[PDB]
């Protein structure tokens, strides 16, 4: 009974994991069971079914920073495949609500809302002009701060500011916007 040979993860967030695979070709194949387990102790979380034509599924409601085993099993009438199992760790949750305030010709203020009740080791701000991406700046901001003021900026110039949350060596997907300076 064939297994999937191309199961892969996509859209990996702090609370969810996406799956894609190529559905197989068989009259016999009726669907795919999906099994989610908390990795390590192997704590069963849930199972879920999709039909034979479906090559996509999203695991939701997961907890951030934790390791899960996800497997997909091919189903026939009164039988099934060996599981195809992969292990994936949910992301660090990003900040939200990027505002730009105090717009000068050589300075701006950047505010974000931290991910609530998550204890990060730091934030990480990257800024660069739009027209010269190779010239990037990195500031490491205290996990208790929610704002930084940038200085020494070129006037009349559009910047890309991004803020990522960081725990140990893992970091979130970036929260990214664009403000330009005055003249």
């Amino acid at each position: 009974v064939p297994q999937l040979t191309d199961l892969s993860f996509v859209d990996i967030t702090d609370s969810s994991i996406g799956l894609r695979w190529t559905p197989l070709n068989s009259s016999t194949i009726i669907g795919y069971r999906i099994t989610v387990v908390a990795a390590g102790e192997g704590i069963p979380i849930f199972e879920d079914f999709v039909d034979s034509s479906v090559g996509y599924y999203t695991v939701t409601g997961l907890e951030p920073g934790i390791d899960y085993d996800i497997s997909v099993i091919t189903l026939i009438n009164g039988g099934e495949s060996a599981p195809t199992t992969l292990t994936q760790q949910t992301a660090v949750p990003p900040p939200t609500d990027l505002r730009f305030t105090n717009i000068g010709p050589d300075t701006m203020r950047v505010t974000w809302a931290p991910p609530p009740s998550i204890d990060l080791t730091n934030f990480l701000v990257r800024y660069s002009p739009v027209k010269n991406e190779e010239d990037v700046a990195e500031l490491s901001i205290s996990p208790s701060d929610n704002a930084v003021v940038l200085t020494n900026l070129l006037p009349g110039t559009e910047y890309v500011v991004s803020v990522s949350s960081v725990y140990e060596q893992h970091e979130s997907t970036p929260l990214r916007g664009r403000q330009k300076t005055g003249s």
Binding site: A39, E41, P44, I45, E63, I66, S117
Partner: protein, 180 residues
């Protein structure tokens, strides 16, 4: 995923090993028994034994490695157990300084360090609390009175017998030596 679940017990029912010694607890443990509110005994394809290796860091946290035989290959996971409020309690995940909103929580319930232990695990997904208990062994075999005691404790947290499993011992992957 919407079916009913046996409630996780209060932490008043999950006591810690008294005077817990992180240095005596380190090293390799075989998982001789398992119980949980989502765990169902399935004799058509049983759960196999695996080992964890708890390595004590300078941090005072553990670098816990799981070794499992799966899909004809040895499988290795590594996690960091950060210590919580009382010796024998650990957290995983990013939520730590907010008790009772914890992602994943560990409590060593009893152990004599050189033979056996019982460890309680509790986590959340989709607003539903899952809990799990392991009977650890320094060897693959344990005495029938230690297993009976595991069954007893598991019942004290509200699990019936069909939520309790004793994994089949295996030779693959799990008998690795390693210096420390």
């Amino acid at each position: 995923s919407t079916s009913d679940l046996i409630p996780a017990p209060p932490l008043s029912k999950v006591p810690l090993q008294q005077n817990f010694q992180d240095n005596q607890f380190h090293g390799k443990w075989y998982v001789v028994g398992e119980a949980g509110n989502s765990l169902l005994r399935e004799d058509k394809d049983p759960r196999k034994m695996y080992a964890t290796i708890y390595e004590l860091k300078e941090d005072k946290s553990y670098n816990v490695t799981s070794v499992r035989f799966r899909s004809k290959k040895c499988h290795y996971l590594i996690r960091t157990f950060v210590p919580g409020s009382q010796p024998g309690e650990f957290t995983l995940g990013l939520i730590k300084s907010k008790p009772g909103h914890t992602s994943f929580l560990v409590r060593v319930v009893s152990t004599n360090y050189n033979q056996h232990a019982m460890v309680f695990f509790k986590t959340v997904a989709q607003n539903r609390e899952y809990f799990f208990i392991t009977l650890y062994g320094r060897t693959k075999e344990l005495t029938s009175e230690l297993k009976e005691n595991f069954i007893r404790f598991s019942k004290s947290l509200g699990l019936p017998e069909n939520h309790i499993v004793f994994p089949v011992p295996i030779d693959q992957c799990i008998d690795g030596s390693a210096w420390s």
